Nucleic acid binder design. Structure first.
Ligand SMILES: [Mn+2]
Ligand SMILES: [Mn+2]
Ligand SMILES: [Mn+2]
Length: 430
DNA sequence: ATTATGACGCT
DNA sequence: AGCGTCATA
């Protein structure tokens, strides 16, 4: 009863850009706005690979990972923007720079954790306490939440989508006790008010729309964010969790979309997150290990303690290229040419990073894949990174991998290389 | 022949 | 240190 931790101590948001690389290209090229369109890398092989898709194009069934030639079969009028190519490879600089635009705006409101190129977690607990003090126990008006869904509402004793949103929001706000500054539901609501402001700032200052989730932890905030994309935000309260989880496939929860989630389903003979509540913590630990078991036990009750890490910048800067099928690198000079191309992009990004962020990478990680290997990476070796020079980095990379060559002929390379990856790691202040 | 990333956990 | 997992556009 009185000692059951409820995991309602924090207010956490997750902000995720809608169709992000597409919006970056649509801002640049107004002809692409409000159209079925997609972003593609390369073009020669089946029209290129799609990596982002506008919501107009999704309506035709176009998805990420689709070849553009195939997407065009579903959507003949699909418009395409190509990722820039530099030094023989796709170059993602435009999208990394657009990401920085958004992250810098979010950072004005609170400490953020950069979770991907297009999303960040926000810990809003302190900002909420401050805003609550400003509001002086005044009610929260629906006008302050013009794009917010309250998950699970409306409920109980209109056929339009926006009408339903407002009905649910009205029920929520009608119920709210605004007279205690410690009610978790109130805290989430004020959190949502701040996120409306954040999302308005992002759109005003960049042109980009986004969605967001507001809840008491990172996992629920991420889940919430996806519930009403695009261009909307969703509040998932502690109380909404039992109904939400009762039909929520386990794989939808962050970190359970892969092998672990599959094992939870198979070993326990269940389908939905809520079904986990019927196991003891020790039972879950017995199957999934101490850490995962404890995590699952709390998470299926809506509780998670993983903090929003204060980290706005990526921890690594990496460059990679696949050499699929016939193009696999079979000669030494081929290997060295591509190592140089990768190293040159890496030096460019590293030098920019050093100037912008007052830090230096100290370790170079070199990874390759060999033809036939099921795994994404066949081999990872590290060496010192002492100077930002592409020629040195590419020479050093070759040194740590050259013994992988099984060829008696040193001119030839065996087995052919299907992937090269260079990654600068272990930053230190400079 | 989705590709090009990035973070974290295990041993 | 090197490997594996899970996630992103
Ligand atoms: Mn997104
Ligand atoms: Mn995202
Ligand atoms: Mn996505």
């Amino acid at each position: 009863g009185p000692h059951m931790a409820t995991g309602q101590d924090r207010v956490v948001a997750l902000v995720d850009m809608d169709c992000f690389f597409v919006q970056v290209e649509q801002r640049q090229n107004p002809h692409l706005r409000n159209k079925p369109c997609a972003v593609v890398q390369y073009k020669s092989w089946k029209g290129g690979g799609i990596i982002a898709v506008s919501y107009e194009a999704r309506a035709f069934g176009v998805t990420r990972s689709m070849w553009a030639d195939d997407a065009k079969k579903l959507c003949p009028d699909l418009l395409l923007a190509q990722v820039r190519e530099s030094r023989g490879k796709a170059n993602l600089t435009k999208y990394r720079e657009a990401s920085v635009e958004v992250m810098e705006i979010m950072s004005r409101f609170a400490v953020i954790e950069r979770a991907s190129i297009d999303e960040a977690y926000v810990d809003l607990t302190s900002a909420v306490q401050e805003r609550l003090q400003k509001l002086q126990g005044q009610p929260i008006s629906a006008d302050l939440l013009p794009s917010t869904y309250i998950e699970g509402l409306p409920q109980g004793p209109t056929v339009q989508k926006e009408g339903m949103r407002k009905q649910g929001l009205f029920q929520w706000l009608d119920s709210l006790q605004i007279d205690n500054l410690t009610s978790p539901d109130l805290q989430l609501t004020v959190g949502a008010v701040i996120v409306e402001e954040m999302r308005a700032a992002i759109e005003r200052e960049t042109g980009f729309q986004c969605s967001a989730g507001i809840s008491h932890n990172k996992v629920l905030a991420k889940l919430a964010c996806g519930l009403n994309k695009p261009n909307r935000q969703t509040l998932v309260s502690h109380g909404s969790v039992p109904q939400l989880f009762s039909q929520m496939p386990i794989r939808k929860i962050r970190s359970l979309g892969g092998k672990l989630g599959a094992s939870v389903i198979e070993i326990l003979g269940i389908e939905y997150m809520g079904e986990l509540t019927q196991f003891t913590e020790s039972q879950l630990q017995s199957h999934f290990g101490e850490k995962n078991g404890s995590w699952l036990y709390a998470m299926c009750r809506g509780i998670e303690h993983d903090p929003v890490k204060p980290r706005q910048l990526p921890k690594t800067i990496g460059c990679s290229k696949n050499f699929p099928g016939k193009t696999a690198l079979a000669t030494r000079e081929q290997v060295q040419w591509w190592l140089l191309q990768l190293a040159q992009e890496l030096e460019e990004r590293l030098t920019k990073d050093r100037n912008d962020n007052d830090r230096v990478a100290t370790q170079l990680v070199v990874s390759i894949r060999v033809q036939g290997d099921k795994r994404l990476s066949s081999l990872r070796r590290c060496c010192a990174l002492t100077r930002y020079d592409a020629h040195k980095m590419s020479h050093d990379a070759f040194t740590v991998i050259k013994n992988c060559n099984t060829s008696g002929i040193q001119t030839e390379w065996s087995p052919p290389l299907t992937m090269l990856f260079l990654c600068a790691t272990k930053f230190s202040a400079s």
